[PDB]
Design a protein around this ligand. Structure first.
Ligand SMILES: Nc1ccn([C@@H]2O[C@H](COP(=O)(O)CP(=O)(O)OP(=O)(O)O)[C@@H](O)[C@H]2O)c(=O)n1
Ligand SMILES: [Mg+2]
Ligand SMILES: [Zn+2]
Ligand SMILES: [Zn+2]
Ligand SMILES: [Zn+2]
Lengths: 50, 58, 50, 1123, 64, 45
DNA sequence: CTGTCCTCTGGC
DNA sequence: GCCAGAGACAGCGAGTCAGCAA
RNA sequence: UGCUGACU
């Protein structure tokens, strides 16, 4: 959160409320949730010999 | 920021790279009639230099 | 050394393990909050030479 | 050397090193050599040059009563800054950390010991205190000299600072190298406005700029008149005086008129117009009355005595010597050498007139040199010391003219009577920048001499100590020829780094390898060595014909006539001495040999410059491999390959150190500048100096005005290796962003850019501004009782809980417009004044410095409050890449509407692909791939210009890097549409590029006025943004608005909004001035005709009534017809 | 100044891999192997640590 | 009890009306006000 | 730094 | 009175934001 | 008002 040196002090109260990742990213619950279509690969000819 | 359509760009030569622009507010009700009828931005489709169109997509 | 607004920002982006389904949304202008809609945490730290 | 240990490719394992924060044992040494010309010049100006300056200083003799008194200044000494008098305690030294906290000048004490005598047998040495002269930061007369980085951190300093600046009121003036013509070298010029100087003058003439020991400069012009005669123009105290040559030559030398003649016809002894015109110079004006050196000196003395202001008891022959010593050829001590130099400048005007030589362009760097901070400082110091002498003895002569015998009792009380002078004059030249001098110092410019050095970034700051200004007068010129970027500034000035508006071509910057000469040497064994080499002294026996011989010059002094078949070998021998450091040839002497053919090429001859203000640059001397240094004029007669395999056998005398030597320090920070078009590298250089970055490490101490800070800077993953030589990661400037080049939104067109909203909410490019306001409360009062103490009368309802009992906000409190901001207390009366916060922006107080009076005796009158203003990227803020692609932020696109890639990623910058086709910044498309490959492989690639050829391409290299990571060669990954959810048909070009955030925000450039203040002379809006202020309509707008036929929009704008009054007129007299009110039925009555039934009100502008009034002032009448 | 808490592009939390990153680099591991051993797969996260400049260690050196 | 920290000594000096603004234990002429415990509210956005 | 005035001046 | 010599003389894009010193 | 920076 921070770094301190002798004589330095932090003192605070944080309030946590409910919300959706739409009005601020901090409230978003997933790193990423993407999707991808399944690739399809077809060998039209028998590949061989290096 | 004052948001403006891109068809009105070539008319002003605005380029959205930091392009301050002024906006005046008529206060007479007789300059509003002329802003509506004469100075409107669709009576300004053709440049008065050679009559060729000014507004267009880009 | 970390500012107050920057500390508040950094604290907003820290994920809390409370499940949001047991809570509720704070009504508009509910500054106080209650057991129903808020969780409070405290950071109080001071650095000293050992 | 000094360019070894230059990194071969950049690294990233220096950050993430176990020793990142430990302050180092010695300072960097590459950053130090940037401000080296500013510091090594001052070091001379203040210690070794000050003695020489005071040594000239002719003893100021004058008459008191029936007595003649002589005052000479034996020594002058400037002391490091220190607590004023001993009235202070516990530390005599004074470190620049303060005077930035307080707002004061870092000034040292200048004191000299004068010696006054009465006829030379009665004498006493008094030591007067002249005044205070400002001091540079690491300048030998400063308290931060010889301090390692660790000890430089306990005094609040940058641990990496190179001062080279002055602190005048805590503002860090940065006096910058101006361009001067040259020193001690005759430049033949063809200027057509010269024939207006007299009846028969021509447009030909050789100018010489003479400097003696860096304390004196003078400009002398030899003009050609149509008769074949040459005139001499000298300037004394800003007045131009014309002396025929011959008067000057006969005075300087006690030689026959045939020997003077045999000298001016040395190389052209067959020409007969010349032989005839030399005689018309010697006889026509000198056999007319004066034929012995003394009679010439006597005649010259009488004509010039009045304007040289010489002593009345001086023989005229002594007043002539005064003119020659102070106005012609300052550089040369002898009068015999001054003769030979005036003779070579004439021998040259005769060749320019007969078209045997080419005019020297004054705008080529070949014939240019720089004016350093020490030359301006000493040249002002010397002039002010002379002025101090003059003023003290003005006071002397004016007080009583009374029996000095007992008056030796108040001699010190007399000298101190005018020793009260030298301090404020000096601060004007530094605080204001403009020069108030009786002689302009042989300068040609009297403003913009010193400028504010602003630390917006460390790339704005480092460019103030490498700037070179052609002149401030050239900003006003129809013709643009001093803005041409000639090919002679190769390696000395950067092609790309020039301001790109009104200052273009006029404000240049030195390349990274270029450097100013600042050392001073003996140069006394050189004239005796040149003779061993083959030169024949000016005295005689050239061994050839004076036409097959080169005229040798060495710093204004003509050694003379090296033979024509010995000049090449002599030049090569002298160049080998300087390279191998043999003899005593300074490592930086410029051995120039301008060959002579039959063509009208530049005047032939072997010059040898060693003066302290020329620009030099290193080049690998082939055939010796010993890293020579060449100058601007010496570089035109030698071949310098850039890459190897460009070196040939006979050609390629030298070779350049690195291929990017030509580019400036900032232009070496642009990645792949070779693949972008040039007008875009000129905008990148100007945009890297307006970037919000990390400006410095010492907050709580600076007390500047504005200070923009970026929260979490990163270091570019793709950066030139020079970025790592001058560690520029101590001060980062931007952030790496995942940019996709896609047309997706409709809001990113025409130069506008899109920013993901979740990236912006996760801290992307957040920033702040520090507004430090110095409240000195000696204002609101004059020299009365202390109305000034910060303080709160107990219980004031106004400051109930916003202040903290010393009339100062709490540290950490938030301030808003209308909030209490300070509370003074007039101690005698006992009344407080809350002084509310009026800025319409929210901030937080982060520190408050209470400052004293410099004697530790101040009384709570001055404070410095620092407010913090959060400036995060809004819509309307300008972003930019490192390639001149600036654009505003038009949208913050939701993070779920952004096109996601097949890897789950989602760009955070959307950049329209239409800025490439017309701007041709192909370096951005390579930086994207290089940065993506870097982020993928954990590497750090270099973007040094000229490292990737046609055979080895950059796209091939980085596409192979990408294809080695599982991505595709061409850098395109295929995205999905975050709005429809379908894989777009085109595969998009995505990558990682380094964005900077510019300092121009809509929050600082937005205005709305309804009604408010008014100019009281015209009664129109005031016209500013800090004041409410109206926007000007303009004549172009008035002429474009009545092409619409809208006369009532014009009436509204120009009449009902700006100024509209009801001034009433007398209808019969038709005059606006005539109606006058009465003494209270208040009837305006016309004064001219006493009727009150004739007055009628008219609606008229207010500037029209002002116009009628100012016309009446001239007796003109405006009679207007009312209907 | 200090490590960002969450990666700007995908809000993956990288504010707890700073000391671990520094520790794997002191052990002899390349920046690539190090960023792999921390779980930073996509290059948007890898740039967040690879190009971080810790200036909180240089500000935390001037007097209190 | 208004405290001010010195510029380089770091000694707590309490200054008032009518008295000079030098620092004890040294003589410097710049002194920074101190942060007291007062409550301020910030938003985490 | 350019082009007309444009008011002499001066010579013829 | 005919027309060079000049030698004054006047003109030189639009808007905008700051800071600093007097 | 001035002057030194800067924006289109
Ligand atoms: N001194 C000035 C400078 C600029 N302007 C105005 O600003 C416009 C854009 O400048 P600009 O320099 O951006 C030319 P632009 O064609 O837009 O650049 P690009 O090739 O990079 O796209 C000009 O065309 C003028 O109308 C002015 O009135 N006075
Ligand atoms: Mg623009
Ligand atoms: Zn009347
Ligand atoms: Zn990520
Ligand atoms: Zn102290």
């Amino acid at each position: 959160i921070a770094q301190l040196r002798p004589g330095q002090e932090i003192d605070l109260l944080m309030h946590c409320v409910k919300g959706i990742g739409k009005d601020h990213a901090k409230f978003s619950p997933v790193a990423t949730a993407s999707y991808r279509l399944l690739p399809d690969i077809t060998l039209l000819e028998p590949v061989e010999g290096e | 920021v004052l948001r403006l359509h891109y068809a009105n760009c070539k008319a002003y030569n605005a380029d959205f790279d930091g392009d301050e622009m002024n906006a005046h507010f008529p206060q007479s009700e007789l300059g509003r009639a002329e802003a509506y009828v004469l100075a409107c931005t669709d009576q300004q489709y053709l440049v008065p230099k050679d009559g060729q169109p000014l507004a267009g997509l880009i | 050394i970390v500012q107050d607004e920057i500390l508040a920002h950094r604290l907003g982006l820290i994920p809390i393990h409370a499940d949001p389904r047991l809570f509720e949304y704070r009504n508009q202008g509910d500054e106080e909050g209650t057991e129903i809609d808020t969780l409070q945490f405290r950071l109080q730290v001071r650095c000293t030479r050992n | 050397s000094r360019w070894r240990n230059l990194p071969s490719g950049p690294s990233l394992k220096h950050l993430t090193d176990p020793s990142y924060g430990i302050p180092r044992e010695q300072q960097k040494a590459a950053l130090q050599e940037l401000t080296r010309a500013h510091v090594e010049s001052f070091n001379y100006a203040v210690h070794e040059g000050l003695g020489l300056a005071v040594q000239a200083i002719p003893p100021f003799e004058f008459a008191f009563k029936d007595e003649r008194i002589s005052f000479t200044i034996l020594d002058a000494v400037i002391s490091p800054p220190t607590v004023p008098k001993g009235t202070i305690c516990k530390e005599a030294n004074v470190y620049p950390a303060e005077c930035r906290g307080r707002r004061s000048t870092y000034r040292g004490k200048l004191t000299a010991d004068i010696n006054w005598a009465v006829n030379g047998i009665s004498k006493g040495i008094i030591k007067q205190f002249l005044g205070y002269v400002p001091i540079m930061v690491k300048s030998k007369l400063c308290n931060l000299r010889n301090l390692p980085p660790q000890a430089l951190i306990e005094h609040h300093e940058e641990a990496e600072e190179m001062g080279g600046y002055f602190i005048i009121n805590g503002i860090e003036k940065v006096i910058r190298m101006l361009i001067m013509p040259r020193r001690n070298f005759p430049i033949a010029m063809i200027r057509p406005k010269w024939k207006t100087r007299g009846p028969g003058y021509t447009q030909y003439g050789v100018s010489m700029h003479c400097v003696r020991e860096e304390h004196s400069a003078v400009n002398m012009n030899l003009h050609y008149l149509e008769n074949g005669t040459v005139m001499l123009n000298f300037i004394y105290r800003k007045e131009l005086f014309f002396l025929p040559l011959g008067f000057a030559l006969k005075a300087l030398v006690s030689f026959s008129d045939y020997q003077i003649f045999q000298e001016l016809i040395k190389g052209k002894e067959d020409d007969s117009f010349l032989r005839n015109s030399v005689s018309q110079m010697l006889r026509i004006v000198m056999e007319e009355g004066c034929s012995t050196q003394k009679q010439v000196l006597n005649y010259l003395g009488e004509c010039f005595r009045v304007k040289l202001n010489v002593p009345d008891w001086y023989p005229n022959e002594q007043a002539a010597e005064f003119l020659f010593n102070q106005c012609i050829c300052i550089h040369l001590k002898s009068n015999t050498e001054k003769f030979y130099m005036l003779c070579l400048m004439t021998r040259k005007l005769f060749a320019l007139a007969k078209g045997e030589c080419m005019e020297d362009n004054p705008d080529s760097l070949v014939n240019q040199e720089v004016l350093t901070p020490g030359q301006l400082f000493l040249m002002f110091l010397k002039e002010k010391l002379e002025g101090w002498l003059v003023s003290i003895k003005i006071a002397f002569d004016k007080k009583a003219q009374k029996t000095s015998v007992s008056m030796n009792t108040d001699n010190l009380m007399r000298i101190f009577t005018m020793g009260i002078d030298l301090t404020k004059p000096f601060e004007y030249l530094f605080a204001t920048g403009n020069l108030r001098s009786k002689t302009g110092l042989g300068l040609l410019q009297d403003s913009g001499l010193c400028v504010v050095a602003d630390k917006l970034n460390f790339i704005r700051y480092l460019s103030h100590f490498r700037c070179v200004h052609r002149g401030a007068d050239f900003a006003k010129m129809r013709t643009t020829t001093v803005r041409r970027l000639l090919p002679e500034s190769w390696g000395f000035l950067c092609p790309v780094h020039t301001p790109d508006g009104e200052p273009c071509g006029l404000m240049n910057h030195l390349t990274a390898v270029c450097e100013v000469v600042t050392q001073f040497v003996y140069t006394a064994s050189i004239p005796a060595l040149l003779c061993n080499l083959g030169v024949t002294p000016i005295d005689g026996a050239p061994h050839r014909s004076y036409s097959e011989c080169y005229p040798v010059l060495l710093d204004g002094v003509m050694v003379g006539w090296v033979d024509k078949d010995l000049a090449p070998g002599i030049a090569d021998s002298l160049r080998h001495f300087k390279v191998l450091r043999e003899k005593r040839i300074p490592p930086w002497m410029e051995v120039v040999l301008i060959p002579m053919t039959g063509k009208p090429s530049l005047y032939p001859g072997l010059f040898l410059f060693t003066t302290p203000c020329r620009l030099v640059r290193p080049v690998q001397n082939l055939a010796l491999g010993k890293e020579e240094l060449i100058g601007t004029m010496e570089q035109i007669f030698m071949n310098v390959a850039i890459f190897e395999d460009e070196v040939f056998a006979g050609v390629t005398t030298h070779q350049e150190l690195f291929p990017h030597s030509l580019l400036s320090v900032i232009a070496n920070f642009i990645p792949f500048s070779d693949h972008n078009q040039s007008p875009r590298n000129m905008y990148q250089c100007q945009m890297g100096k307006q970037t919000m970055g990390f400006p410095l490490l010492t907050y709580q101490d600076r007390s500047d005005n504005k200070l923009y800070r970026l929260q979490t800077p990163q270091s570019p993953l793709v950066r030139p290796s020079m970025y790592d030589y001058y560690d520029m990661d101590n001060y980062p400037i931007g952030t790496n962003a995942i940019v996709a080049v896609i047309s997706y939104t409709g809001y990113d067109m025409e130069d506008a850019m899109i920013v993901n909203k979740a990236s912006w909410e996760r801290g992307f490019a957040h920033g702040s501004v520090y507004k430090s306001e110095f409240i000195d409360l000696s204002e609101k009062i004059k020299q009365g009782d202390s109305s000034l103490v910060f303080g709160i009368k107990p219980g004031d309802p106004r400051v109930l809980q916003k202040l903290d009992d010393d009339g100062l906000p709490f540290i950490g409190a938030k301030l808003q417009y209308g909030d209490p901001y300070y509370s003074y207390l007039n101690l005698n009366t006992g009344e407080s004044f809350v002084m509310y916060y009026k800025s319409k922006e929210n901030c937080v107080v982060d520190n408050i410095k209470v400052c004293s009076n410099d004697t530790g005796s101040g009384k709570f009158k001055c404070v410095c409050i620092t407010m913090r203003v959060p400036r995060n990227p809004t819509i309307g803020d300008k972003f930019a890449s490192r390639h001149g692609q600036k654009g505003i932020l038009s949208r913050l696109w939701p993070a779920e509407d952004m096109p996601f890639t097949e890897s789950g990623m989602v760009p955070d910058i959307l950049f329209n692909p239409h800025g490439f086709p017309s701007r041709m910044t192909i370096g951005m498309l390579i930086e994207s791939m290089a940065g993506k490959s870097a982020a993928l492989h954990g590497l750090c690639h270099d973007a040094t210009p000229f490292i990737f050829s046609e055979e080895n391409s950059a796209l091939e290299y980085f596409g192979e890097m990408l294809k080695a990571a599982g991505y595709n060669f061409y850098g395109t990954e295929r995205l999905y549409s975050g709005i429809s959810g379908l894989e777009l048909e085109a595969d998009i070009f995505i990558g990682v590029v380094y964005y900077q955030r510019l300092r121009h925000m809509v929050s600082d450039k937005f205005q709305v006025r309804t009604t408010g203040a008014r100019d009281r002379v015209t009664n129109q809006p005031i016209g500013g943004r800090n004041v409410q202020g109206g926007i000007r309509f303009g004549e172009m707008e008035r002429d474009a608005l009545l092409a619409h036929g809208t006369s009532f929009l014009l009436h509204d704008r120009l009449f009902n909004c700006s100024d509209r009054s009801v001034a009433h007129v007398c209808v019969k007299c038709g005059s606006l001035l005539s109606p006058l009110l009465e003494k209270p039925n208040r009837k305006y009555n016309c004064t001219l005709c006493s009727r009150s039934d004739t007055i009628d009100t008219v609606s008229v502008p207010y500037v029209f009534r002002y116009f009628v009034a100012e016309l009446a002032a001239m007796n003109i009448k405006v009679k207007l017809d009312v209907v | 100044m200090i490590i960002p808490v969450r990666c700007f592009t995908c809000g993956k939390i990288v504010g707890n891999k700073w000391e671990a990153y520094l520790g794997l680099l002191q052990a002899e591991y390349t920046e690539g192997d190090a960023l792999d051993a921390l779980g930073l797969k996509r290059y948007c996260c890898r740039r967040m640590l690879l190009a971080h400049v810790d200036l909180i260690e240089k500000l935390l050196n001037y007097a209190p | 009890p208004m405290i001010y920290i010195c510029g380089e000594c770091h000694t707590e000096n309490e200054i008032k009306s009518r008295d000079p603004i030098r620092c004890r234990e040294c003589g410097y002429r710049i002194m920074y006000k101190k942060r007291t415990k007062r409550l301020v509210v910030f938003d985490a956005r």
